[PDB]
Write a protein that holds these residues in place. Sequence first.
Motif, PDB file in Angstrom:
ATOM      1  N   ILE B  52       0.928  -1.128   0.000  1.00 21.18           N
ATOM      2  CA  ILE B  52       0.000   0.000   0.000  1.00 21.18           C
ATOM      3  C   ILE B  52       0.983   1.195   0.000  1.00 21.18           C
ATOM      4  CG2 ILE B  52      -1.706   1.307   1.358  1.00 21.18           C
ATOM      5  CD1 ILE B  52      -2.790  -1.311   2.442  1.00 21.18           C
ATOM      6  N   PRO B  53       1.278   1.746  -1.192  1.00 24.75           N
ATOM      7  CA  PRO B  53       2.190   2.874  -1.400  1.00 24.75           C
ATOM      8  C   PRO B  53       1.547   4.257  -1.363  1.00 24.75           C
ATOM      9  CG  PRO B  53       1.695   1.868  -3.501  1.00 24.75           C
ATOM     10  CD  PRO B  53       0.759   1.245  -2.480  1.00 24.75           C
ATOM     11  N   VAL B  54       1.735   4.944  -0.249  1.00 31.80           N
ATOM     12  CA  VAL B  54       1.188   6.268  -0.062  1.00 31.80           C
ATOM     13  C   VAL B  54       2.146   7.319  -0.600  1.00 31.80           C
ATOM     14  CG1 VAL B  54       0.282   7.865   1.610  1.00 31.80           C
ATOM     15  CG2 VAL B  54       0.190   5.406   2.033  1.00 31.80           C
ATOM     16  N   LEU B  55       1.807   7.910  -1.744  1.00 32.45           N
ATOM     17  CA  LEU B  55       2.617   8.964  -2.355  1.00 32.45           C
ATOM     18  C   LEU B  55       2.370  10.265  -1.590  1.00 32.45           C
ATOM     19  CD1 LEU B  55       4.455   9.986  -4.544  1.00 32.45           C
ATOM     20  CD2 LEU B  55       2.500  10.040  -6.125  1.00 32.45           C
ATOM     21  N   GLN B  56       3.420  10.848  -1.014  1.00 33.38           N
ATOM     22  CA  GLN B  56       3.281  12.081  -0.235  1.00 33.38           C
ATOM     23  C   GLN B  56       4.065  13.277  -0.777  1.00 33.38           C
ATOM     24  OE1 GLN B  56       4.812  10.221   3.406  1.00 33.38           O
ATOM     25  NE2 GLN B  56       2.728  10.422   4.250  1.00 33.38           N
ATOM     26  N   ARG B  57       3.490  14.471  -0.629  1.00 33.83           N
ATOM     27  CA  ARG B  57       4.115  15.720  -1.066  1.00 33.83           C
ATOM     28  C   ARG B  57       3.714  16.810  -0.082  1.00 33.83           C
ATOM     29  NH1 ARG B  57       1.000  13.773  -5.901  1.00 33.83           N
ATOM     30  NH2 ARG B  57       1.783  15.062  -7.637  1.00 33.83           N
ATOM     31  N   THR B  58       4.595  17.776   0.147  1.00 33.43           N
ATOM     32  CA  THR B  58       4.297  18.844   1.103  1.00 33.43           C
ATOM     33  C   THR B  58       3.196  19.786   0.606  1.00 33.43           C
ATOM     34  OG1 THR B  58       6.706  19.008   0.837  1.00 33.43           O
ATOM     35  CG2 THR B  58       5.797  19.728   2.938  1.00 33.43           C
ATOM     36  N   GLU B 103       7.738  -2.522 -10.267  1.00 35.41           N
ATOM     37  CA  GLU B 103       6.448  -2.256 -10.889  1.00 35.41           C
ATOM     38  C   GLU B 103       6.105  -0.796 -11.129  1.00 35.41           C
ATOM     39  OE1 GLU B 103       3.882  -6.322  -9.848  1.00 35.41           O
ATOM     40  OE2 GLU B 103       3.393  -4.494  -8.743  1.00 35.41           O
ATOM     41  N   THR B 104       6.557   0.103 -10.259  1.00 34.26           N
ATOM     42  CA  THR B 104       6.213   1.515 -10.428  1.00 34.26           C
ATOM     43  C   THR B 104       7.404   2.442 -10.618  1.00 34.26           C
ATOM     44  OG1 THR B 104       6.268   2.305  -8.107  1.00 34.26           O
ATOM     45  CG2 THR B 104       4.366   1.054  -8.781  1.00 34.26           C
ATOM     46  N   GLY B 105       8.566   2.013 -10.138  1.00 32.53           N
ATOM     47  CA  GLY B 105       9.745   2.838 -10.258  1.00 32.53           C
ATOM     48  C   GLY B 105       9.965   3.690  -9.020  1.00 32.53           C
ATOM     49  N   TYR B 106       8.935   3.857  -8.194  1.00 32.05           N
ATOM     50  CA  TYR B 106       9.066   4.673  -6.991  1.00 32.05           C
ATOM     51  C   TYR B 106      10.002   4.059  -5.977  1.00 32.05           C
ATOM     52  CZ  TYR B 106       5.163   7.533  -8.542  1.00 32.05           C
ATOM     53  OH  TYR B 106       4.371   8.375  -9.293  1.00 32.05           O
ATOM     54  N   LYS B 107      10.662   4.920  -5.210  1.00 27.53           N
ATOM     55  CA  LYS B 107      11.565   4.471  -4.160  1.00 27.53           C
ATOM     56  C   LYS B 107      10.932   4.914  -2.846  1.00 27.53           C
ATOM     57  CE  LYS B 107      15.937   4.697  -6.793  1.00 27.53           C
ATOM     58  NZ  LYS B 107      15.562   3.676  -7.815  1.00 27.53           N
ATOM     59  N   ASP B 138       8.469  14.563  -3.013  1.00 28.62           N
ATOM     60  CA  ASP B 138       9.221  15.803  -3.141  1.00 28.62           C
ATOM     61  C   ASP B 138      10.635  15.484  -3.590  1.00 28.62           C
ATOM     62  OD1 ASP B 138       6.999  17.198  -2.057  1.00 28.62           O
ATOM     63  OD2 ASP B 138       7.732  16.762  -0.025  1.00 28.62           O
ATOM     64  N   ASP B 139      11.124  14.321  -3.178  1.00 26.25           N
ATOM     65  CA  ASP B 139      12.464  13.889  -3.531  1.00 26.25           C
ATOM     66  C   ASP B 139      12.578  13.725  -5.041  1.00 26.25           C
ATOM     67  OD1 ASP B 139      14.779  11.965  -3.942  1.00 26.25           O
ATOM     68  OD2 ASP B 139      14.877  12.290  -1.769  1.00 26.25           O
ATOM     69  N   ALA B 140      13.636  14.296  -5.610  1.00 25.06           N
ATOM     70  CA  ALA B 140      13.872  14.248  -7.048  1.00 25.06           C
ATOM     71  C   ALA B 140      13.885  12.838  -7.612  1.00 25.06           C
ATOM     72  CB  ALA B 140      15.185  14.940  -7.378  1.00 25.06           C
ATOM     73  N   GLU B 141      14.400  11.895  -6.834  1.00 24.89           N
ATOM     74  CA  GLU B 141      14.479  10.519  -7.293  1.00 24.89           C
ATOM     75  C   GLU B 141      13.086   9.978  -7.606  1.00 24.89           C
ATOM     76  OE1 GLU B 141      16.311   7.560  -4.560  1.00 24.89           O
ATOM     77  OE2 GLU B 141      17.889   7.479  -6.091  1.00 24.89           O
ATOM     78  N   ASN B 142      12.073  10.606  -7.020  1.00 25.97           N
ATOM     79  CA  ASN B 142      10.694  10.190  -7.231  1.00 25.97           C
ATOM     80  C   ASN B 142       9.939  11.132  -8.161  1.00 25.97           C
ATOM     81  OD1 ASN B 142      10.490   7.750  -5.649  1.00 25.97           O
ATOM     82  ND2 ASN B 142      10.595   9.033  -3.806  1.00 25.97           N
ATOM     83  N   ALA B 143      10.602  12.199  -8.596  1.00 21.47           N
ATOM     84  CA  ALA B 143       9.973  13.154  -9.496  1.00 21.47           C
ATOM     85  C   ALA B 143       9.712  12.515 -10.859  1.00 21.47           C
ATOM     86  CB  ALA B 143      10.854  14.370  -9.653  1.00 21.47           C
ATOM     87  N   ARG B 144      10.522  11.524 -11.212  1.00 25.42           N
ATOM     88  CA  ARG B 144      10.391  10.827 -12.488  1.00 25.42           C
ATOM     89  C   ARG B 144      10.703   9.353 -12.233  1.00 25.42           C
ATOM     90  NH1 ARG B 144      12.409  14.326 -15.710  1.00 25.42           N
ATOM     91  NH2 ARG B 144      12.470  15.548 -13.766  1.00 25.42           N
TER      92      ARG B 144
END
Lengths: 206, 206
Positions: B52-58, B103-107, B138-144
């Motif tokens: 369950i991947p919760v994508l967070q941003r400020t 599967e998604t590329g997210y870290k 917010d982390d660049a590694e997750n920006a793309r």
Amino acid sequence: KQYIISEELISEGKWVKLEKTTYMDPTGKTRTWESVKRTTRKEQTADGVAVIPVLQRTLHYECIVLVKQFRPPMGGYCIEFPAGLIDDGETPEAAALRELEEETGYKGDIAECSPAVCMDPGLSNCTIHIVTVTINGDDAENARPKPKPGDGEFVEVISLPKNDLLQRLDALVAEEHLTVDARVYSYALALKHANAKPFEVPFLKF
Amino acid sequence: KQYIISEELISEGKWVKLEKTTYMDPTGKTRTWESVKRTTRKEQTADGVAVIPVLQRTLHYECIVLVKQFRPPMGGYCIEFPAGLIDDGETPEAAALRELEEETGYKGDIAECSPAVCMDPGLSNCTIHIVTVTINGDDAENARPKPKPGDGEFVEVISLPKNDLLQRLDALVAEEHLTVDARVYSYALALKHANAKPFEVPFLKF
């Protein structure tokens, strides 16, 4: 873009069947896959239903009614939402109320019904309808639940407080050493993710 | 009271097997059952994990990252929590992050990890660990994000707003005609039962 090319029975029992599935992948290629199917599945219908029974009482906290029973494939006891396959000439809503009564003895109302959802897409084609049933505990009809165990249906009813279900479940695990159903856990988890630390989230904004 | 007496293999495939399970009931009689097990299951370990991947941003609303892919046993596309079996020399947590990235590329990081929960107790023995993972958007590694699919792994990623999840899932169903996974739906349901009509309960109090 993808589709099933063919399906060939590998093995079939009285209730379950394993099949060799052949399908076309996105880039033209052809691959195989081993799939599980129930022999009881009806055309344009889900295999069964699962009931989220919210026990309600006046000026009292809500409870989620769950059932505990021995599951041969697990080789041990499990805590689950009341469930069952959909009988002949029966609607999912109708099944829901029936199975809830058969396993718990409670008589409730349909609050909401979901579309058909898959149980284990990578392994089987099994789908169910998740039905939220609201039980009035103040009603005399629900004063003393009269379960109706079918032949071979041995069910232990467990009413857990909703506000801290996830913790009740972990308590139950650490105490009895049994398995919680993945759907029940997801639901409990979500409740925690939305209820837990109310003022904590709107605190970091400052 | 109950226990497993014997388990005779009805038929086996390369990845899945069906078998006749004979067990003891509470009273004393003996009964049989058709069970499904995976050939890849390890000792003292669960079959796999679901993230369950919760994508967070400020100053930004959370999103739940889900995946859509073709499922042979289903004969169609499904919306699911990123998942997969636990590889050799892998911990449930490691499997969680690996599969999320593949599967998604997210870290992301581990927020919590459930104990092993059952996928379908009445049909199989399959268990997974449900892992809640936060992704710093917010982390660049997750920006793309950049997925690393394997052979025969074709996955579409779908970020859906958290506080609006169940309706976004219903929209998708009505628009694309696919199937939502039972666990994803359950989680979505709990969210609605806890967030929707927040002033409905206290108003009925007065």
